[PDB]
């Protein structure tokens, strides 16, 4: 229990990333590879 | 180093979830909250 506040660091970053990652990935596959 | 393979469990689940979560959230806000 020494990485409680530290763990969140990954929960936030991974979020802001996964979001723009997936959201963007959608379009790229939705027909953006012309 | 006793939670190496276990950690991945969260890296996968959180993914399949965050994906459908964000992707779906987009539409819901893109004009699906009538």
Swiss-Prot record, chains A, B:
The chain crosses the membrane at residues 9-29. Expressed at high level in placenta and pancreas. Also detected in CD11c+ immature dendritic cells. Only expressed in dendritic cells and not in other leukocytes, including monocyte precursors. TLR3 is the TLR that is expressed most strongly in the brain, especially in astrocytes, glia, and neurons. Heavily N-glycosylated, except on that part of the surface of the ectodomain that is involved in ligand binding. It is found in: Endoplasmic reticulum membrane; Endosome membrane; Early endosome. It comes from the Eukaryota. ds-RNA binding is mediated by LRR 1 to 3, and LRR 17 to 18. Belongs to the Toll-like receptor family. Monomer and homodimer; dimerization is triggered by ligand-binding, the signaling unit is composed of one ds-RNA of around 40 bp and two TLR3 molecules, and lateral clustering of signaling units along the length of the ds-RNA ligand is required for TLR3 signal transduction. Interacts (via transmembrane domain) with UNC93B1; the interaction is required for transport from the ER to the endosomes. Interacts with SRC; upon binding of double-stranded RNA. Interacts with TICAM1 (via the TIR domain) in response to poly(I:C) and this interaction is enhanced in the presence of WDFY1. Key component of innate and adaptive immunity. TLRs (Toll-like receptors) control host immune response against pathogens through recognition of molecular patterns specific to microorganisms. TLR3 is a nucleotide-sensing TLR which is activated by double-stranded RNA, a sign of viral infection. Acts via the adapter TRIF/TICAM1, leading to NF-kappa-B activation, IRF3 nuclear translocation, cytokine secretion and the inflammatory response. It is linked to Immunodeficiency 83, susceptibility to viral infections: An immunologic disorder characterized by increased susceptibility to severe viral infections, including herpes simplex virus (HSV), varicella zoster virus (VZV), influenza A virus (IAV), hantavirus, and possibly respiratory syncytial virus (RSV). IMD83 clinical manifestations include acute infection-induced encephalitis and pneumonitis. This is Toll-like receptor 3. The lineage of its organism: Eukaryota, Metazoa, Chordata, Craniata, Vertebrata. The chain holds residues 698 to 730 of 904 of the full protein.
